Design a protein around this ligand. Structure first.
Ligand SMILES: NC(=[NH2+])NCCC[C@H](N)C(=O)O
Ligand SMILES: [Cl-]
Length: 240
């Protein structure tokens, strides 16, 4: 019943994430290779340090992140998770740690084309299974051809192969792909987005002791400009 005590006793904070989402979380060559890195990971490390424990990153696909939290495979879920009303029926969320827009990644040659909703409606769109960007397309563009894919890298791969024309994703991720790759760009078209649905850490309900610690760390990071600095550090790093 006491999250903070259980965490101290097992000597680790277990954080479920989906590392297909630079600059939030992704894989990098770090003193060797195969390391999960990113702004969410730095923030999780800050939470583990506050609790005086080791950080364990449990990687999985995004549509299983909240499921694993719900069933006790993780203490927290940190994966650029939008704090929605519907999600708040099942989970508690920390205060927001970062707020951003949702945009489309397209080929550079198509940037002049994909400027409105009308252009997307006949295009082949992809979004990640179990995400807010996926729901927005389903809800606002129900006659667009939507392919839902488990892994975000796989969606961008289909974009590059030309099977997909546009990929809906959090803007910092689209900006990262566009910056790291010559023939990709962020489109100007955007769908209607919900106010205050920002990124937050998810917890199981009645985890108030642990929520307080997570909130304290997040507040300090926001007050020091540190989450923003984490994202900029991440954008310097090389994906794998
Ligand atoms: N690591 C990831 N793939 N994260 C996807 C997050 C997508 C969106 N922000 C959501 O909460 O549904
Ligand atoms: Cl761009």
């Amino acid at each position: 019943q006491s999250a903070v005590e259980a965490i101290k006793q097992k000597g680790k904070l277990v954080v479920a994430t989906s590392p297909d989402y630079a600059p939030f979380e992704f894989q990098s060559l770090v003193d060797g290779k195969n390391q999960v890195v990113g702004a969410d990971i730095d923030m999780a490390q800050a939470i583990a340090d506050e609790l005086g424990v080791k950080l364990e990153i449990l990687s999985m696909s995004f549509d299983n992140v909240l499921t694993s939290l719900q069933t006790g495979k993780a203490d927290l879920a940190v994966a650029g998770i939008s704090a929605t009303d519907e999600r708040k029926e099942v989970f508690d969320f920390s205060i927001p740690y970062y707020e951003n827009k949702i945009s489309f990644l397209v080929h550079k040659a198509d940037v002049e084309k994909y400027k409105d909703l009308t252009s997307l409606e006949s295009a082949n769109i992809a979004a990640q299974k179990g995400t807010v960007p996926e729901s927005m397309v389903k809800e606002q563009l129900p006659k667009a051809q939507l392919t839902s894919l488990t892994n975000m890298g796989e969606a961008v791969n289909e974009l590059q192969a030309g099977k997909i024309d546009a990929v809906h994703m959090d803007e910092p991720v689209a900006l990262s792909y566009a910056a790291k790759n010559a023939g990709l760009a962020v489109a100007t078209v955007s769908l209607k987005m919900k106010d205050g649905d920002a990124n937050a850490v998810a917890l199981r309900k009645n985890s108030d002791d642990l929520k307080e610690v997570v909130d304290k760390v997040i507040q300090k990071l926001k007050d020091e400009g540190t989450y923003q600095s984490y994202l900029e550090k991440a954008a310097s790093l090389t994906e794998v």
